[PDB]
UniProtKB/Swiss-Prot annotation, chain A:
Enzymatic class: hydrolase
Induction of synthesis: By allolactose.
GO function terms (MF aspect): alkali metal ion binding; beta-galactosidase activity; carbohydrate binding; identical protein binding; magnesium ion binding
Record entry for activity regulation: Inhibited by phenylethyl thio-beta-D-galactoside (PETG), isopropyl thio-beta-D-galactoside (IPTG), L-ribose, D-galactonolactone, lactose and 2-amino-D-galactose.
Subunit structure: Homotetramer.
Site feature (Transition state stabilizer) residues: H345, H379
The protein's name: Beta-galactosidase
The family this protein is said to belong to: Belongs to the glycosyl hydrolase 2 family.
E.C. designation(s): 3.2.1.23
Entry superkingdom: Bacteria
PROSITE patterns the record matches: GLYCOSYL_HYDROL_F2_1, GLYCOSYL_HYDROL_F2_2
Keyword tags: Glycosidase, Hydrolase, Magnesium, Manganese, Metal-binding, Sodium
Phenotype when changing G782A: It forces the apoenzyme to adopt the closed rather than the open conformation. Reduces the binding affinity
Swiss-Prot record, chain B:
Annotated protein name in UniProt: Beta-galactosidase
Entry superkingdom: Bacteria
BP-aspect Gene Ontology terms: lactose catabolic process
Residues that coordinate or bind Na(+): N1
Residue window of the full protein shown: 605 to 1024 of 1024
Induction remark: By allolactose.
Positions marked as site (Important for ensuring that an appropriate proportion of lactose is converted to allolactose): W396
Length: 1011, 420
């Protein structure tokens, strides 16, 4: 029997699914959520042994511990212990597609544990074992005797162990299979691992027990009165003395309580459920749950004899909230939600897919700190504790079934097969059975990338039957099929249609209004954050705010799925697809997060935070209008801090108490500002500061900001008259200017500033030259590879046209002696195979105060693929410790991703000017820069720049960040114009036209001086 | 408010309307033409496609392919091998749908739809032709004067502008070449505003109160320098209103031994002034030529937010077609995306917008009825590196879209002025 190769067999001897149990025997412990003596953990040191296949496991391992076995920590993924490789593959299955068959070589984990059971647990009641998650299929033995079998990697499997255990020492043996027929339904874009990766536990329940319970809360039109409806199932012996009391607690107060015997309403010709009871509790003015305000009550479910003896108690957190679609909108408590969401896999760089409380909390606090209100469980039910934390901290959760069949052809081959309905149902139904009582969960999802099959319709309807209180969503088969209450596309663009056959991705704006369509639109996945990305994010949020039925979306995704490996020296590095000898693989496509694997923020997270603000600001005169995008809470923990600065120099600051009702406005008059006589640009900056700390934030947390240009006074005053005059020298192969200790050299063969001097110290290591290329971002590369080119990708369009091997031919290099200046004039052409790609024209005018004014004018062929940049690069000799700039900052900011950035005077160590993306590329650019300081050097103008110890050549030649070695001196890329980064997706050109360098003619000017 | 004058003469707007309302849409990939019929009922049984490829105005190859497109359907026309010329310039494809037979409503050979793509472009690498002549600089107390052969340029050291030009003993200018940041207000510029009831939101009023119109150019810098084979004039001005600096023009004039005056303008615009209507220069010429011949978007009047209709090519028109007779006189006759403009002996090269006529902006803004307009001495020429949008969504509130406002803060352009 090969149950792992049979989709008609997804379990044996497995107990029904149900919400979380603890079997409290004290009701007060149930109320407070204190640990239960009846809930034991079996986590800890276990014995493990790896085999190539289940045929290779010896018969003796059932009765006796294997001598070769090692002691390992459980929960764990055996790949993280290095028993075999983890495989990163996206769409293409890690195994041959041949359902229901798996390879004969099927890596096999043999876990075992010897553990102690107290005698009392066997004298009465039932003792079950709980495996919160085993990947992907297992058989269980206890004391040599076979217990059962189980599949579904991401939901718990429980087994009654009563008849198997003896008082004292018992032995579990778990044979875990890496591949099974269940694998075909677990094809998510992530690392492919295996083991007992979630918690293991023992649970004692009495013979007479609570077997299930459902909490539903329905409301009146204005939410002044609620009814909590608790439905309770029992197992065991039914007698007339049996009662159930459900009581509802606001902290330490009991607001309501109901008591009833068993025997529900009549439901058909045959009677009622003798073993069931429903209790209704009236709750006047109930405190409402939301992400803004996670008000929670406690429901204690007491099974007892009518004369007072408690049999057991179960409990849950209850959040009074109503989810409904009405008139095309998703409403929470009668108000239109705006989903500031993200997709979060369960990933840890060290522990693999094992989740722990600390990680979970770090994540939640980070999400809330960055203006997220919602999370999608991509693409499986999570560790049960995740839902508890979301209930309490306040996040909207999309709970998603563990079904992804992306690798099939066509994508719905299994989901449209009635032979896979049994398998798929288990995965939907057991999720809902487990999680339906969590207030945080607001939407059910049928799975991920599995086409649209009839099994999706059947299962869609099943949920709507069992739980009318949540909407159902599912993206497969075009985002708007009959198996979804929500239009939930992935990577639909804001304005640009993408008219694929069968499954188009319409512009989200356009999607809402298609004939006969009325559903709300919330993107299940958008703004793919792979490497240097999130360009065009403000575009989305402009739309979300403008269109009522565009109700936001979930960013893809939260945390890079990178793993730590060690080298010869034993030093850690970040690893991705292929780095474990795993092949075939999909390389760095496993790292698409707003944060690194160690939860260090990418720069992109700040653009998310800014656009997802709950406060909007308008300015008119010296009057600021603040609008609250909150639906429920007043801005109680909010004050506004405003400052005025002239080119970085502050001139007036101050704070005003914010008292803005939800969806209301407040007007704030500025004090008459002192207008400066000094020349430059006035800038207003406001910040919302939270003075009080919270569960999720520290004191003085900044939640929102915004900038305006105020009055601008232009510099009329001419530069002071320098009495000196630069001396020009003309040799055959050099133009040499001289003033004081300052000295410039121009090479007559190449046409570039070849060297510079202050004193007799060199300033340059490579000459100052033009640059029209960048180290390709993940967005520029897409799905293109050395062996399988994608000619569409930005990197490949560049390569082919010859941008990277453009050879600079000289057309002119002359010198001229002005009244009080020396004027070098240069012109270049960059060509590839007869075709002139670009043309550069430059004047360098060095005056009497040592200042050199570079004027650049580039022509770009209209038929050449647009350039990544138009600017100048050189290798500075100076290795300074600090970078000081008047510009947009403080963090890396780009043309299509700079809304969060603020204009001011910025100062940072040189290491902060480099963003350590695991796959090296162009990074660290600052835009909107009027002035740049680095040691002796200063550049003025209006430019974009990046300053690092890594050349664009190295960053383009290096696969991993840890393989980057610092070069001599400091590479400097000053750009007059830079292309967008994009990232609507990362498999097709995503940079929007207005951020492309398509003007054909470009002009910028720098002044290089010494201070 | 019409697309035609009361006599049924088309306004320039009617061509933009015609072009956008076309019943055929086109896509180009490689050298295939994808034709999509937006008809719902008829086939294209009275339709033909004329295609032609031009290098900066010179036709290289033309051809006409028959159209058989069903309603809502597509046709794929594979073009023949187009000739890639060595010559430097911009290749353009132009396609036209032509109705070969007369209908109850149209003449035979009626044009129903058109579209242009840039094809290949070859950038000029080869050097300018050799010049051994060298312009001679004269420096008087209050004039900079350049001289080459019979050509004489005169820069006023007091005002800062090119004050006069001579070809032989002939005056070329009737006013000095100055900067212009204003335009004669259009109807979309005035809105509901009146001199008796001011609407402060209207563009014209924003410009007025900011002093855009009465701005005095106060010179900051006017130096001159001699190079190996050129004279470099370098100027800098600031248009101020009541202590407030609104614009700053910084120019460089480079006359060389071939006869051509290269102009480089860099303008700063204050962020807290209303965005300027234009950024270019104006002069009253002396010559009155008969024909305007330009390489750029044409032939009819076109603006940055109204120019899909216009095609790039070589257009030659009588001077009077370069003026649009709106009953209420305003800024008009502009042609966008120009690389060359020819007027009498003059020629301007580069990349700009232009309008040319006998009517000063000052007169057009002071004249309420087109019949009251008197033709002035010489020819007023407006050359803008940049011109604001014209709007139209409505005419009682500002309707110029963000992308067609001149908000950038810093603008640059370059112009070659020669004789032929
Ligand atoms: Mg099976
Ligand atoms: Mg997938
Ligand atoms: Na919305
Ligand atoms: Na991915
Ligand atoms: Na790289
Ligand atoms: Na035809």
């Amino acid at each position: 029997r090969r149950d792992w190769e049979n989709p008609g067999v997804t379990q044996l001897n497995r107990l029904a699914a149900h919400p979380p149990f603890a079997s409290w025997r004290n009701s007060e412990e149930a109320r407070t959520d204190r640990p239960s003596q009846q809930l034991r953990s079996l986590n800890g040191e276990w014995r493990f042994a790896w085999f190539p296949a289940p045929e290779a496991v010896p018969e003796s391992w059932l009765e006796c511990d294997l001598p070769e076995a090692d002691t390992v920590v459980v929960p764990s993924n055996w790949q993280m212990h290095g028993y075999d490789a983890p495989i990163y593959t996206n769409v293409t299955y890690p195994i041959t597609v041949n359902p229901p068959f798996v390879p004969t070589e099927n890596p096999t984990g043999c876990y075992s544990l010897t553990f102690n059971v107290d005698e009392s647990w066997l004298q009465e009641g039932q003792t079950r074992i709980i495996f919160d998650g085993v990947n992907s299929a297992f058989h269980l033995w206890c004391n040599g005797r076979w217990v059962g079998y189980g599949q579904d990697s991401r939901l718990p499997s429980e087994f009654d162990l009563s008849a198997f255990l003896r008082a004292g020492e018992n032995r579990l043996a778990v044979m875990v299979l890496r591949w099974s027929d269940g694998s075909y339904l677990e094809d998510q874009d992530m690392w492919r691992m295996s083991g007992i990766f979630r918690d293991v536990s023992l649970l004692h329940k009495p013979t007479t027990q609570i077997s299930d319970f459902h909490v539903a809360t329905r409301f009146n039109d204005d939410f002044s009165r609620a009814v909590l409806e608790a439905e309770v199932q029992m197992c065991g012996e039914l007698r007339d003395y049996l009662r159930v009391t459900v009581s509802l607690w606001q902290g330490e107060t009991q607001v309501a309580s109901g008591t009833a015997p068993f025997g529900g309403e009549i439901i058909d010709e045959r009677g009622g459920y003798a073993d069931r009871v429903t209790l209704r509790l009236n709750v006047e003015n109930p405190k409402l749950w939301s992400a803004e305000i996670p008000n929670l009550y406690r429901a204690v479910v007491e099974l007892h004899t009518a004369d007072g003896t408690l049999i057991e108690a179960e409990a849950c957190d209850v959040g009074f909230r109503e989810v409904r679609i009405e008139n095309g909108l998703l409403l929470l408590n009668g108000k239109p939600l705006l989903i500031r969401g993200v997709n979060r896999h369960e990933h840890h760089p060290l522990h693999g897919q094992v989740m722990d409380e600390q990680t979970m909390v770090q994540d939640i606090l980070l999400m809330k700190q960055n203006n997220f209100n919602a999370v999608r469980c991509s693409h499986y039910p999570n560790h049960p504790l995740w839902y508890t934390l979301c209930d309490r901290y306040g996040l909207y959760v999309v709970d998603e079934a563990n079904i992804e069949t992306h690798g099939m052809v066509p994508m719905n081959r299994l989901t449209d097969d009635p032979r896979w309905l049994p398998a798929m149902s288990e995965r939907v139904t057991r999720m809902v059975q487990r999680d339906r009582n969590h207030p945080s969960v607001i939407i059910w999802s049928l799975g991920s990338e599995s086409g649209h099959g009839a099994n999706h319709d059947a299962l869609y309807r099943w949920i709507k039957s069992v739980d009318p209180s949540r909407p159902v969503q599912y993206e497969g088969g075009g985002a708007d099929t009959t198996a979804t209450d929500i239009i939930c596309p992935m990577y639909a663009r804001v304005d640009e249609d993408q008219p694929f056959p069968a499954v188009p991705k319409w512009s989200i704006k356009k999607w809402l209004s298609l004939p006969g369509e009325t559903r709300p639109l919330i993107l299940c996945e958008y703004a793919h954050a792979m490497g240097n990305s999130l360009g065009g994010f403000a575009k989305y949020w402009q739309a979300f705010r403008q269109y009522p039925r565009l109700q936001g979306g979930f960013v893809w995704d939260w945390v890079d799925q990178s793993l730590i490996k060690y080298d010869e020296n034993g030093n850690p590095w970040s690893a991705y697809g292929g780095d474990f000898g795993d092949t075939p693989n999909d390389r760095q496509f496993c790292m698409n997060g707003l944060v690194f694997a160690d939860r260090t923020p990418h720069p992109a997270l700040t653009e998310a935070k800014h656009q997802q603000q709950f406060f909007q600001f308008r300015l008119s005169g010296q009057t600021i209008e603040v609008t609250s995008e909150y639906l429920f809470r007043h801005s109680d923990n909010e004050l506004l801090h405003w400052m005025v600065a002239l080119d970085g120099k502050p001139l007036a600051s101050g704070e005003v108490p914010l008292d803005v009702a939800p969806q209301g406005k407040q007007l704030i008059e500025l004090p008459e500002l002192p207008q400066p006589e000094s020349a430059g640009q006035l800038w207003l900056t406001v910040r919302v500061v939270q003075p009080n700390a919270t569960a999720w934030s520290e004191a003085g947390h900044i939640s929102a900001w915004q900038q305006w240009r105020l009055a601008e006074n232009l510099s009329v005053t001419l530069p002071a008259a320098s009495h000196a005059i630069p001396h020009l020298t003309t040799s055959e192969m050099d133009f040499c200017i001289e003033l004081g200790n300052k000295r410039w050299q121009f090479n007559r063969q190449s046409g570039f500033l070849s060297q510079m001097w202050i004193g007799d110290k060199k300033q340059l290591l490579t000459p100052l030259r033009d640059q029209f290329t960048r180290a390709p971002l993940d967005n520029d590369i897409g799905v293109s590879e050395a062996t399988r080119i994608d000619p569409n990708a930005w990197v490949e369009r560049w390569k082919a046209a010859g941008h990277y091997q453009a050879e600079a031919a000289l057309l002119q290099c002359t010198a001229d002696t002005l009244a009080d200046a020396v004027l070098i004039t240069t012109a270049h052409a960059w060509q590839h195979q007869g075709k002139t790609l670009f043309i550069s024209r430059k004047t360098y005018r060095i005056d009497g105060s040592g200042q050199m004014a570079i004027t650049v004018d580039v022509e770009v062929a209209s038929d050449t693929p647009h350039p990544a940049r138009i600017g100048l690069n050189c290798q500075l000799a100076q290795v300074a410790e600090r970078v000081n700039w008047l510009g947009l900052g403080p963090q890396e900011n780009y043309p299509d991703r700079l809304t969060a950035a603020c204009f001011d005077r910025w100062d940072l160590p040189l290491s902060d000017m480099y963003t350590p993306y695991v796959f090296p590329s162009e990074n660290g650019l600052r835009c909107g820069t009027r002035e740049l300081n680095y040691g002796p050097h200063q550049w003025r103008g209006d430019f974009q720049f990046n300053i690092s110890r890594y050349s664009q050549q190295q960053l383009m030649e290096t696969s991993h960040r840890h393989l980057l070695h610092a070069e001599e001196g400091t590479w400097l890329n000053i750009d007059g114009f830079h292309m967008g980064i994009g990232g609507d997706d990362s498999w097709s050109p995503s940079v929007s036209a207005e951020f492309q360098l398509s003007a054909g003619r470009y002009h910028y000017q720098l002044v290089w001086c010494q201070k």
